[PDB]
């Protein structure tokens, strides 16, 4: 929608960096689902509780990282 009201240019816009990043955070979420679900059905309880650990870490790491991103992003382009 946004990119439709713009002329094709030859450079990377600040809008592109922000769309591309949020895109990644969601892509990695999917990746996480796969990783978690894959090592989860593994017979050994060794991997099973690792699967649990990944979620716990993600529940915090993702927000934190996204917050860090915002800080870097806005300081770079809000100037």
Positions touching ligand LMT (CB under 6 A) are 56, 59
**Residue 27, CA distances (Å) to 15, 49, 60, 62, 79 in order:** 18, 24, 17, 12, 29
Residues 6+ positions from 42 with CB-CB distance below 8 Å: 48
Is 30 among the residues that bind ligand UND (CB under 6 A)? no
Q: Give the residue closest to ligand IVM by C-beta.
A: 20
Smaller CB distance to ligand LMT: residue 59 or 79?
A: 59
Give the x/- contact pattern for another protein in 6-45, rule: CB under 8 A. Answer: -xxxxxx---x------x---x--xx--xx-xx--x----
Q: Residue written as tokens 């979420």?
A: 29
């Amino acid at each position: 929608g946004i990119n439709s009201q713009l002329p094709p240019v030859s450079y990377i816009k600040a809008i592109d960096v922000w769309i591309g990043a949020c895109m990644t955070f969601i892509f990695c979420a999917l990746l996480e689902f796969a990783l978690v679900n894959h090592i989860a059905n593994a017979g050994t309880t060794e991997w099973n509780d690792i699967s649990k650990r990944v979620d716990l870490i993600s529940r915090a790491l993702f927000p934190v990282l996204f917050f860090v991103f915002n800080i870097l992003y806005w300081s770079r382009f809000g100037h």
